[PDB]
Design an enzyme around this catalytic site. Structure first.
Site, short mmCIF file in Angstrom:
data_model
loop_
_atom_site.label_atom_id
_atom_site.label_comp_id
_atom_site.label_asym_id
_atom_site.label_seq_id
_atom_site.Cartn_x
_atom_site.Cartn_y
_atom_site.Cartn_z
N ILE A 6 -48.56 -36.82 100.92
CA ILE A 6 -47.44 -35.74 101.57
C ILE A 6 -45.93 -36.69 100.84
CG2 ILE A 6 -46.82 -34.61 103.47
CD1 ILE A 6 -49.03 -35.76 105.06
N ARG A 53 -44.71 -40.75 98.87
CA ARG A 53 -44.98 -42.30 98.85
C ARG A 53 -43.41 -42.88 98.51
NH1 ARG A 53 -48.04 -42.28 94.50
NH2 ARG A 53 -50.22 -42.59 95.52
N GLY A 54 -43.41 -44.29 99.10
CA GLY A 54 -42.09 -45.16 99.10
C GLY A 54 -42.83 -46.36 98.28
N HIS A 55 -41.84 -47.44 98.23
CA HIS A 55 -42.53 -48.78 97.70
C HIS A 55 -43.53 -49.50 98.60
CE1 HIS A 55 -41.50 -52.27 94.86
NE2 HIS A 55 -42.16 -52.82 95.93
N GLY A 66 -44.91 -48.21 101.70
CA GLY A 66 -45.75 -47.12 102.22
C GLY A 66 -46.14 -45.90 101.12
N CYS A 67 -47.14 -45.25 101.88
CA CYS A 67 -47.87 -44.11 101.46
C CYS A 67 -48.21 -43.16 102.42
CB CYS A 67 -48.77 -44.21 100.49
SG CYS A 67 -49.44 -42.64 99.47
N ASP A 80 -32.67 -46.34 114.12
CA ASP A 80 -32.41 -45.60 112.85
C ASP A 80 -32.70 -44.13 113.35
OD1 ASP A 80 -32.11 -44.99 110.15
OD2 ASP A 80 -34.25 -45.13 109.91
N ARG A 110 -33.46 -37.11 109.20
CA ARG A 110 -34.45 -37.52 108.45
C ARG A 110 -35.72 -38.27 109.14
NH1 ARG A 110 -30.26 -40.92 106.84
NH2 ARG A 110 -30.18 -42.90 108.01
N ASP A 115 -39.69 -42.34 113.52
CA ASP A 115 -39.31 -43.39 112.55
C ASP A 115 -40.17 -43.65 111.20
OD1 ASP A 115 -37.51 -45.21 111.25
OD2 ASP A 115 -37.65 -46.78 112.78
C1 LIG Z 1 -42.82 -36.22 104.45
O1 LIG Z 1 -43.42 -35.02 105.04
C2 LIG Z 1 -44.29 -35.17 105.92
C3 LIG Z 1 -44.41 -36.24 106.67
C4 LIG Z 1 -45.28 -36.41 107.85
C5 LIG Z 1 -45.48 -37.56 108.66
O2 LIG Z 1 -44.62 -38.60 108.24
C6 LIG Z 1 -44.61 -39.52 108.95
C7 LIG Z 1 -43.52 -39.66 109.89
C8 LIG Z 1 -43.43 -40.88 110.96
C9 LIG Z 1 -44.09 -41.79 110.90
N1 LIG Z 1 -43.67 -42.87 111.69
C10 LIG Z 1 -44.44 -43.98 112.10
O3 LIG Z 1 -45.50 -44.60 111.26
C11 LIG Z 1 -43.93 -44.99 113.10
C12 LIG Z 1 -42.89 -44.17 114.20
O4 LIG Z 1 -42.53 -43.10 113.93
N2 LIG Z 1 -42.42 -44.79 115.27
C13 LIG Z 1 -41.51 -44.24 116.06
C14 LIG Z 1 -40.50 -45.06 116.56
C15 LIG Z 1 -39.57 -44.51 117.57
C16 LIG Z 1 -39.91 -43.34 118.00
F1 LIG Z 1 -39.20 -42.80 119.07
C17 LIG Z 1 -41.00 -42.64 117.73
C18 LIG Z 1 -42.07 -43.08 116.81
C19 LIG Z 1 -43.22 -46.35 112.69
C20 LIG Z 1 -44.60 -46.26 113.44
C21 LIG Z 1 -45.25 -42.09 110.16
C22 LIG Z 1 -45.18 -40.83 109.19
F2 LIG Z 1 -46.29 -40.96 108.05
C23 LIG Z 1 -46.19 -37.74 109.90
C24 LIG Z 1 -46.86 -36.27 110.22
N3 LIG Z 1 -46.72 -35.37 109.47
C25 LIG Z 1 -45.97 -35.21 108.40
C26 LIG Z 1 -45.74 -34.10 107.65
C27 LIG Z 1 -44.88 -33.93 106.44
O5 LIG Z 1 -44.64 -32.77 105.70
C28 LIG Z 1 -45.67 -31.76 105.81
C29 LIG Z 1 -45.63 -31.02 104.68
C30 LIG Z 1 -44.23 -30.00 104.55
N4 LIG Z 1 -44.37 -29.34 103.47
C31 LIG Z 1 -43.74 -28.02 103.75
C32 LIG Z 1 -42.97 -27.48 102.59
O6 LIG Z 1 -43.48 -27.62 101.30
C33 LIG Z 1 -43.47 -29.02 101.12
C34 LIG Z 1 -43.35 -29.83 102.24
#
Ligand SMILES: COc1cc2c(Oc3ccc(NC(=O)C4(C(=O)Nc5ccc(F)cc5)CC4)cc3F)ccnc2cc1OCCCN1CCOCC1
Ligand SMILES: [Cl-]
Length: 265
Positions: free
Chosen positions: A23, A25-27, A29-30, A133, A137, A151
């Site tokens: 979905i 990738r960064g440096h 994490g993925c 943060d 985004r 985040d």
């Molecule tokens: C980039 O696209 C996506 C990223 C996603 C995703 O990413 C993450 C988000 C947050 C964390 N957070 C974390 O790992 C943590 C966190 O969030 N902590 C935290 C901190 C404060 C808070 F208040 C709540 C939580 C750090 C631990 C981890 C993730 F991996 C998680 C779940 N579903 C995702 C779906 C995505 O697109 C779906 C496809 C969309 N398509 C439609 C159109 O065509 C192309 C795109």
């Protein structure tokens, strides 16, 4: 840490990671697409967050999440010995959703997303948690259009002491002292509403990253967006008050934005 990980530990047997589908990738994490299995054998679409190669940092990030139970805060499904399993958000991050020219949310819908972040942040501020943060985004949007405050952590141009800072989202006291409080999350929330009402436009385009502190001290703030109602711009200006004690609490933010939202058909 590990006593808490063991509480939310997912068996490798219960999780299938689709490494063929990334979905993003960064440096550091993925993020992959994934299938999580329950004891009844039913499949749960999910996102598997993995480290490319600081291991405890990744596991702490996911462990803080275990304490968060609110419909406007991203939840943790579990940890798999490592991979962090999150519920899949069909619409991705909020900034990317609003930035799509073919999506046409009303001024009410955008305010509605702003009220959702506010509700989530209220719950976080209650739990004594400081985001650090807050930005569009880092807000996720699910199938039922529910904003989940999150985040991207390790998996995260808008960022510039090793400090990787989102300066354009930062409060005056945080830019000058690198210390953050719930009141500083309120500033960033003001920037988040500006982002929503402009539909993902970059804050302070004409302005440089480092120079943002002296831009603000000159008595400058983000201009009123075109879709932005006047009372809602008044809210944004309350968030950007130079003194932290004068900024609305998240509880007052839910209140004032509920009243603005409720004036639309
Ligand atoms: C980039 O696209 C996506 C990223 C996603 C995703 O990413 C993450 C988000 C947050 C964390 N957070 C974390 O790992 C943590 C966190 O969030 N902590 C935290 C901190 C404060 C808070 F208040 C709540 C939580 C750090 C631990 C981890 C993730 F991996 C998680 C779940 N579903 C995702 C779906 C995505 O697109 C779906 C496809 C969309 N398509 C439609 C159109 O065509 C192309 C795109
Ligand atoms: Cl006004």
């Amino acid at each position: 840490l590990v006593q808490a990980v063991q509480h939310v530990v997912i068996g490798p047997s219960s999780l299938i990671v689709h490494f063929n589908e990334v979905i993003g990738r960064g440096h550091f994490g993925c993020v992959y697409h994934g299938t999580l299995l329950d004891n009844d054998g039913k499949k749960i679409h999910c996102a598997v967050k993995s480290l490319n190669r600081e291991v405890s940092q990744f596991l702490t990030e996911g462990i803080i999440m275990k304490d968060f139970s609110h419909p406007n805060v991203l939840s943790l499904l579990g940890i798999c010995l490592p991979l962090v399993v999150l519920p899949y958000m069909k619409h991705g991050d909020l900034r990317n959703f609003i930035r799509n020219e073919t999506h046409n949310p009303t001024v009410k819908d955008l305010i509605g997303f702003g009220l959702q972040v506010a509700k989530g942040m209220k719950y976080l501020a209650s739990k004594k948690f400081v985001h650090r943060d807050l930005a569009a985004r880092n807000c996720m949007l699910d199938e039922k259009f529910t904003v989940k405050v999150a985040d991207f952590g390790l998996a995260r141009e808008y960022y510039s002491t090793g400090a990787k800072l989102p300066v354009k989202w930062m409060a005056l006291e945080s830019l000058q002292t690198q210390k953050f409080t719930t009141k500083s999350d309120v500033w960033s929330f003001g920037v988040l509403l500006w982002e929503l009402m402009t539909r993902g436009a970059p804050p302070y385009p004409d302005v440089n990253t480092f120079d943002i502190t002296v831009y603000l001290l000159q008595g400058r703030r983000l201009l009123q967006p075109e879709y932005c109602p006047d009372p809602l711009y008044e809210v944004m200006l309350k968030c950007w008050h130079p003194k932290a004690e004068m900024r609305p609490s998240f509880s007052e933010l839910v209140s004032r934005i509920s009243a603005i939202f409720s004036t639309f058909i």
